[PDB]
Amino acid sequence: LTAHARIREAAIEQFGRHGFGVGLRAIAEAAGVSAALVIHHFGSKEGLRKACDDFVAEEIRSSKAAALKSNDPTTWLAQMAEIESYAPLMAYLVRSMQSGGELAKMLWQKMIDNAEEYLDEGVRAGTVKPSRDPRARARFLAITGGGGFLLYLQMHENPTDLRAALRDYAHDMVLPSLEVYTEGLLADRAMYEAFLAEAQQGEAH
């Protein structure tokens, strides 16, 4: 019960730090239990990777949806306090794209589905504007939002002190994002109108 979780916590730290070829012996050890107990809980190395994948998607879906269902900003500020505590996750999350094995591709797909889900939750709660194509919107925001942070750390000073990186992202990125996501960027619907027209005619014939 707490046993499942301690093992899962451990694997995320190990897959984060040392990658996937890491020792299940080290995993059991970090966890502080037998290698056998680990196999009973997760079946294979694969079964453990997915159990970590699944969990990562859920920890951020539950975190985003929380921030989006409340129009109480103190829950956001509080949330941004603990930003450094997501380092163990993110670490794992980056190994996933690097080790871009289809097990990884199946994750971003689930995270995308999770983005649609909670953006809609927030639309319903009134924190986020409704969209003309929420599915597309979710996709766009996940690719850029996520691919954004990925790029942020490759170019960071210390690409492994995820705690630092996350702090520096919060400093660097939070404010201008909120600006663009609250005010927009373009000055009029000029270009939006244009492209829409080019596509509604494209749909017509």
- Would you tell me which residues interact with a copy of itself (CB under 8 A)? 71, 73-74, 76-77, 80, 97, 100, 105, 108, 126-129, 131-133, 136-137, 139-141, 143-152, 154-155, 172-196, 198-199
**Minimum CB distance to a copy of itself, residue 117 (Å):** 16
Write out the DSSP string of 11-70.
HHHHHHHH-SS--HHHHHHHHTS-HHHHHHHHSSHHHHHHHHHHHHHHHHHHHHHHHHH-
Asked whether 10 and 17 are in contact (CB, 8 A), the reply is no
In the bound state with a copy of itself, the residue whose beta carbon lies nearer, of 48 and 104, is 104
**Minimum CB distance to a copy of itself, residue 25 (Å):** 31
Helix H or strand E segment including 120? helix 102-125
In the bound state with a copy of itself, the residue whose beta carbon lies nearer, of 5 and 174, is 174
In the bound state with a copy of itself, the residue whose beta carbon lies nearer, of 3 and 143, is 143
Which tokens hold the place of 93?
């999350």
In the bound state with a copy of itself, the residue whose beta carbon lies nearer, of 2 and 154, is 154
**Minimum CB distance to a copy of itself, residue 194 (Å):** 4
Which tokens hold the place of 128?
């986020």
